[PDB]
Design an enzyme around this catalytic site. Structure first.
Site, PDB file in Angstrom:
ATOM      1  N   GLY A 110      -9.334 -16.779  64.477  1.00 25.07           N
ATOM      2  CA  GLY A 110      -9.523 -15.924  63.324  1.00 25.07           C
ATOM      3  C   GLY A 110     -10.966 -16.053  62.856  1.00 25.07           C
ATOM      4  O   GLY A 110     -11.574 -15.063  62.451  1.00 25.07           O
ATOM      5  N   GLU A 147     -12.736 -21.248  55.653  1.00 22.11           N
ATOM      6  CA  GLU A 147     -14.045 -21.570  56.254  1.00 22.11           C
ATOM      7  C   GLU A 147     -14.994 -22.217  55.288  1.00 22.11           C
ATOM      8  O   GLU A 147     -15.749 -23.106  55.676  1.00 22.11           O
ATOM      9  CB  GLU A 147     -14.716 -20.332  56.873  1.00 22.11           C
ATOM     10  CG  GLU A 147     -13.841 -19.644  57.922  1.00 22.11           C
ATOM     11  CD  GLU A 147     -13.167 -20.562  58.924  1.00 22.11           C
ATOM     12  OE1 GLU A 147     -13.845 -21.487  59.416  1.00 22.11           O
ATOM     13  OE2 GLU A 147     -11.978 -20.361  59.229  1.00 22.11           O
TER      14      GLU A 147
HETATM   15 ZN   LIG Z   1     -10.057 -24.682  60.087  1.00 19.43          ZN
END
Ligand SMILES: [Zn+2]
Ligand SMILES: O=C(CN1C(=O)COc2ccc(Br)cc21)NC1(C(=O)O)CCC(F)(F)CC1
Ligand SMILES: O=C(CN1C(=O)COc2ccc(Br)cc21)NC1(C(=O)O)CCC(F)(F)CC1
Length: 857
Positions: A273, A310
């Site tokens: 992702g 993130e």
């Molecule tokens: Zn991660």
């Protein structure tokens, strides 16, 4: 000459301090060249330096000592051990202990045609032109495919990166661009500032024609989103979310983000992702880009959670890093958990804290098998390390941290994580460091060792006799000693305060102040355990759900539905009693318990679809639609409401149309006809688009028209909705075409192939084609996605885990055992074998019971 090192791990006595990386990528020929200069020190005399390198052609290596006037160079002899992904550099005299040296290596490589290393990515402009870019993805062990290095996460060092490129391209990297210099043969050399000390896997660089947008945080950090020019107009949502989330984390952790800027780049081809490279986080376009007119509510939630994940890693992973991959959960479980902590505060409208428990039920599915591994477990080779990126490290890791935070309290947990991050800043940790930090603020080590060093989770059995509540724990297993320190919680008919009880032994007892009508353990599903109630316990909770279901929270109702069906699997509750409990769903209105009912009931008919069971399969599907008919009928065909109302709407309308519920099918047919007659210009409500497209693609004309719109779409949601709809065709030539084309990567990108293979694997007529395709194209799929990757694990489980016959089990065992070193030892193969074994036993025990129950119902 034999290779002078026989271990997968590098020697511990030669340490890097700084790398100077010069990379020249020629995007017209896909060749790249580099010069790596690594400053090292040796703590024991050695004439041999071992380091990592994979698929690089080394032309020259030299060892420097001193600077300017006193520089001395010595040529190094180069030896290679490709199986260990190592090279050995041999000096003509030993290195002097504790003195600085610089290893200088010149090499060449070819841009990878995979999604890892320094790899090629492409896209077509809306004008039809093919554009080529080059990007990196190093985690876990692919930095060695771009530059020779000490490629293990505990060898932290600073990096000074220089990129030679054509003037028509832009280069970005971890740190700001400080200077661009014209060099020979019409090229420009960009110089990026030196990084802070960090692991090799976090180095990143991209050569592209991306556009960008930016915004500055209150702390002065420049945040930018980068994307292809035709999609930069979709960057604002993520840019605003990234600024808000970076500010959140800086304040929450009391540790400023240390770099001048943070970039978020949407890459046209990307395997996972997203990735947390320090200063340059990268994403699939679907995980970052939001189109206010075509993006779904679930994609808005996904972008916010992905950016939060993130950014959490800038602290949990980048600033503090696990010492070795056996403790990857210290990065992943924390990043996954912090998505919920942060977005609960930054984007309260998404109500994400309500969805957290669903990740715990995901991890329980896999963790209930004998093939599950403890959260912290030994790994050595690259395929074994890639296998750590799984639901245990991410979801079980987040779930045990949530359980620990509720146990300690949020403020004590926060103090513990701040002390941990401050103490271990720019260094590496193991499990014990986290327990020591949490305890520096009560028992954490003994408790948390039970949750990180043992696989699985306990079943807690509750027996009530008047005021006496007896508790017992045992390992829950489908198909031995285990003991946990379980922070139990409960409510009762007389008290909705969350009561706490720490169960550290096989059994214990507590005495209620007064008798109660019912008791419910695991409040809000904040604990990683399941609960069984002896005697009239399940009848009492079944009665509670049927008469006054709002007496417990929506998440508590989801927990009772999940646990009742998990108890059928181990013979503690009959399938008839779990199905009788599910009947309360006729009056359920909330997304979590409705979705949990789907999660338990849908897999039963998916098993039936692959068996000679049409009559029961039809009756079971009709029972499911009858159960949710009133809720389906109440749905509007609009994009109105909260994110939960929108997601519930979309799923119910899709389910009703897939099951041929005529009021919904006729409404979908009308919208598809109007949309098609408008030449696909018409703006449909995004929340009904999955149902409308799925119905439309059931004719040859509709399928062809839908596929014709796919090439022009710039919307990740619209391309996903089209892919889902096309994969529901019952024309086997069109299904084989979808597999061949996505595998090739031209009309449909190869990054979509794992998803298309799973969707076809779940298609009631096409499912044999998916398993067949996986077997036939195994070698090329492994070459593209890598052994041990989560993509390969998803393809193996997606094509096989709904089988339930001994013939299908032997196909799976026979195919994977035949692969020897190329896949026979994959953990995903053992998981799917154990799943099919469970499906065989479950269907043999319960099929006739379900047939009889359906005839009575
Ligand atoms: Zn991660
Ligand atoms: O069944 C599936 C996919 N699926 C599994 O394969 C296994 O368990 C699940 C649990 C919950 C949900 Br929602 C989906 C699944 N999807 C649908 C189907 O019948 O194939 C039914 C739902 C649809 F109508 F929304 C899409 C199609
Ligand atoms: O199937 C999936 C998820 N999914 C995959 O597993 C494989 O790749 C995909 C590609 C496109 C789309 Br849209 C969905 C998927 N989700 C649903 C389901 O489980 O059936 C339940 C939620 C839903 F209603 F939004 C779509 C269907």
């Amino acid at each position: 000459t034999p290779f002078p090192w026989n271990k997968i791990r590098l020697p511990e006595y030669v340490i890097p301090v700084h790398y100077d990386l010069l990379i020249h990528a020629q995007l017209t020929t896909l060749t790249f060249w580099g010069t790596t200069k690594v400053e090292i020190t040796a703590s024991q005399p050695t004439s041999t330096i071992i380091l990592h390198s994979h698929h690089l052609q080394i032309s020259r290596a030299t060892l420097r000592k001193g600077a300017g006037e006193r520089l001395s160079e010595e040529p190094l002899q180069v030896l290679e051990h490709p199986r260990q992904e190592q090279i050995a550099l041999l000096a003509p005299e030993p290195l002097l202990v504790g003195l600085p040296y610089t290893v200088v290596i010149h090499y060449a490589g070819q841009l990878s045609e995979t999604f890892h290393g320094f790899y090629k990515s492409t896209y077509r402009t809306k004008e039809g032109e093919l554009r080529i870019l080059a990007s990196t993805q190093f985690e876990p062990t692919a930095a060695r495919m771009a530059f020779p290095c000490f490629d293990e996460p505990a060898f932290k060092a600073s990096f000074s990166i220089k990129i030679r490129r054509e003037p028509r391209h832009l280069a970005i990297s971890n740190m700001p661009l400080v200077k661009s210099v014209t060099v020979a043969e019409g090229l420009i050399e960009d110089h990026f500032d030196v990084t802070v000390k960090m692991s090799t896997y976090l180095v990143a660089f991209i050569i592209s024609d991306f556009e960008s947008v930016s915004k500055i945080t209150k702390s002065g950090v420049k945040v930018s989103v980068y994307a292809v020019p035709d999609k930069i107009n979709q960057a604002d949502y993520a840019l605003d979310a990234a600024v808000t989330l970076l500010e959140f984390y800086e304040d929450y952790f009391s540790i400023p983000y240390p770099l001048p800027k943070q970039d978020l780049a949407a890459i046209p081809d990307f395997q996972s992702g997203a990735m947390e490279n320090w200063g340059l986080t990268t994403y699939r376009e679907s995980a970052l880009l939001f189109d206010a007119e075509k993006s779904s509510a679930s994609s808005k939630l996904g972008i916010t959670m992905t950016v939060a994940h993130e950014l959490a890693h800038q602290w949990f992973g980048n600033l503090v890093t696990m010492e070795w991959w056996n403790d990857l959960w210290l990065n992943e479980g924390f990043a996954k958990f912090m998505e919920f902590v942060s977005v609960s505060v930054t984007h309260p409208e998404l109500k994400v804290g309500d969805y957290f428990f669903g990740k715990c039920f995901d991890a329980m599915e896999v963790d209930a098998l004998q093939s599950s591994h403890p959260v912290s477990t030994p790994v050595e080779n690259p395929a074994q390390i890639r296998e750590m990126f799984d639901d245990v490290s991410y979801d079980k890791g987040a779930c045990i941290l949530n359980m620990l935070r509720e146990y300690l309290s949020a403020d004590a947990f926060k103090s513990g994580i701040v002390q941990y991050l401050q103490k271990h800043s720019y260094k590496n940790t193991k499990n014990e460091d986290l327990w020591d930090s949490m305890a520096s603020i009560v028992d954490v080590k003994t408790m948390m060792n039970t949750w990180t060093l043992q696989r699985g989770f306990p079943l807690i059995t509750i027996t009530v006799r008047g005021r006496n509540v007896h508790m017992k724990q045992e390992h829950y297993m489908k198909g031995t000693g285990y003991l946990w320190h379980v922070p139990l919680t409960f409510i009762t008919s007389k008290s909705d305060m969350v009561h706490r009880f720490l169960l550290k032994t096989k059994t214990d007892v507590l005495i209620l102040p007064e008798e109660v009508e019912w008791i419910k353990f695991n409040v809000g599903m904040n604990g990683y355990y399941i609960v069984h109630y002896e005697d009239d316990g399940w009848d009492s909770l079944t009665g509670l759900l049927k008469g006054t279901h709002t007496a417990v929270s929506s998440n508590d109702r989801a927990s009772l539905i999940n646990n009742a069906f998990q108890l059928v699997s181990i013979g503690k509750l009959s399938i008839e009693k779990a199905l009788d409990l599910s009947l309360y769903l006729k009056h359920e209105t909330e997304i979590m318990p409705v979705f949990q009912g789907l999660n338990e009931l849908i897999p039963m008919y998916k098993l039936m679809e692959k068996r000679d069971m049409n009559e029961v399969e039809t009756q079971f599907k009709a029972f499911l639609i009858r159960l949710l008919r009133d809720l389906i009928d109440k749905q509007t065909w609009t994009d109105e409401g909260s994110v939960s109302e929108r997601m519930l709407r979309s799923q119910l309308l899709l389910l009703a149309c897939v099951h041929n519920y005529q009021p919904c099918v006729q409404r979908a047919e009308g919208y598809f006809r109007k949309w098609k007659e408008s030449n696909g210009q018409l703006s449909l409500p995004v929340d009904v688009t999955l149902a409308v497209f799925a119905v439309g693609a059931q004719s040859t004309e509709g399928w062809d028209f839908l596929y014709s719109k796919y090439q022009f779409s710039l919307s990740s949601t619209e391309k996903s909705q089209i892919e889902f709809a096309l994969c529901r065709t019952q024309n086997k030539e069109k299904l084989q075409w979808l597999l061949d084309e996505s595998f090739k990567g031209d009309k449909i990108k190869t990054q979509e192939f794992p998803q298309i293979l799973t969707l076809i694997g779940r298609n009631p007529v096409g499912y044999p084609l998916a398993w067949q395709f996986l077997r036939k194209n195994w070698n090329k799929l492994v070459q593209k996605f890598e052994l041990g990757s989560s993509s390969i694990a998803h393809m193996v489980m997606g094509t096989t885990n709904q089988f339930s016959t001994r013939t299908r089990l032997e196909e799976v065992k026979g195919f994977f055992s035949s692969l020897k070193e190329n896949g026979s030892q994959l953990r995903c193969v053992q998981q799917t074998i154990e799943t099919i074994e469970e499906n065989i036993g479950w269907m043999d025990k319960n099929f006739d019971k379900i047939r009889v129950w359906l005839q009575s119902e």
